[model samples]
Target: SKLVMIFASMSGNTEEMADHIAGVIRETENEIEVIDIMDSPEASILEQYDGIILGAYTWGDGDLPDDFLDFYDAMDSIDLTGKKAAVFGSCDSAYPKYGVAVDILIEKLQERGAAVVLEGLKVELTPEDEDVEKCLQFGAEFVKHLS
Candidate 1:
């Protein structure tokens, strides 16, 4: 299956998680492309993939980071019906709401008619060794539903 991972990472935490997930997907022999959301890739590109993975670090008060805001809005123009999708992100316990960015993205994917295959992976600050394992498993699980 063809997959695309788009991520926004300021402190590199979310990017690392994206990498782990992408690595797992590659090991399974699926084609996966990783893109930095900072480049402002068009949301329409999602139509070309069999699956989509999105990552972002939450900002103030459970908000999408500045880098993801435009892309999030841009996604409104695309129809993701029948597409497989998942979301992952880093969050802060200091914030009242955790992984709200992930939550909202999942909501968006559903709104766009995508089949969200799993719950969003939410890691605290930077991922630990166990968290890396979780990301790997998340990738594996997501790949399973693509069939």
Candidate 2:
């Protein structure tokens, strides 16, 4: 899959997941652009890539980060009639809405006509050694579905 990744993070765990996915994709001899979701214009363009992966940390009570609002609006305005997508994020299990951002993204993208190809990945802090392999498989499996 030609994948484009956009991510928003506060404590940086989400960003690490994005980077890990990008790294795994690159190792497999594919090209993917991992972008920060803050003030990003490229995020709205699903035409250039066949798949989209978004990573974001959930704010208080299952809310998206403040800076991501503008891009969220942009993403909302577009229609991805033939694209595929996946979401990944990290949050404290203590929160009632832990990692709910993943579901929100998947639902919205699916509503906009993007085929959600994989289950959302919810990682814990620092991402345990087990998580690294799963992150690799997440991206790899997404590509499998797309291709």
Candidate 3:
């Protein structure tokens, strides 16, 4: 099975986390694809993968990252039935929407027909031990479950 990690980063923190998660998934010998949410193909293309991991840095008022705006909106219209999905994100705790960006993504994906493998897994900027481990573990288990 193939796993795709899609993310949008401003200061690159979220991308870095996605890279770490991708590395862990690779360690499990799973095929992995990591792409910036803006650079990734359209939501229509997500059907090609068995599982998807979404990452983004929370923006103004808990909004989706600038680069991911299009894809984030597009997700609502996609048909993702049978597709396994997971979410992770980076944000400053100072912001009220700290992890809402990721949380919103998970909800939208599920509403669009994707089977969310992990309910809600989020990581804040400069995450603590538990947050980092949760992201890593979610990545590993998401693929394992989908595979």
Candidate 4:
């Protein structure tokens, strides 16, 4: 399935997660585009892909990055209807809510009519050994629901 990975990265943790996820997806000959949420095209064209995986870095206490707010708003204009979705993100465990941004994306995607495929991933800082496996599993697992 063709997939788009929309991400809002601050210190690059979320971006790194996208990279790892892409690696897993590539093994299956599936197409994947990793777009910076701040630079993505109109959200209304989401139907172009079979699925979307959203990632972001949390800013404050469980807050979405300020710039992502705009993209999130744009998401409201689109109808994912039967599209597949999965949310993932990274944050410092030092933060009170490590994966709050992912939670926000998941909730919004559901509201926008996406069929969320798995338990969202929440990485601490960057992808280490275990986290790498988890990221790989995230991609491999979500793609199964494409059928």
Best-fitting candidate, scored by lDDT: 1
The RMSD of every model to the true structure, in order and in angstroms, is 0.7, 1.5, 1.7, 1.3
lDDT of 4 by residue, 1-147 (tens): 788888888788888888888878888867888888778566776767889988888987789998888778888888888889999998787777778888899999999899999988988897889998999999899878886
Full-model lDDT for every candidate: 0.93, 0.81, 0.79, 0.85
Better of 2 and 3 by lDDT: 2
Each prediction's TM-score versus the true structure? 0.98, 0.91, 0.89, 0.93
lDDT of 2 by residue, 35-103 (tens): 787756554566578788888888877988777677766777788888888999987888888888888
Residue 22, candidate 4: Cα error in Å is: 1.2
Instruction: Please give the ranking of all candidate structures by TM-score, highest first, separated by commas.
Output: 1, 4, 2, 3
How many pairs collide in each candidate, listed in order?
0, 0, 0, 0
For model 3, the run of ten residues with the poorest summed lDDT:
119-128
Q: Is candidate 1 or candidate 2 better by lDDT?
A: 1
lDDT of 1 by residue, 1-147 (tens): 899999999999999999999998999878999999999899999988999999988898889989888888988999999899999999999889888999999999999999999999999999999999999999999999997
Better of 1 and 3 by lDDT: 1
Which lDDT value does model 4 have at 79?
84
Tell me model 3's lDDT, rounded to 2 decimals.
Answer: 0.79
User: In model 2, which range of ten residues has the least summed lDDT?
Assistant: 38-47
lDDT, residue 145, candidate 3? 83
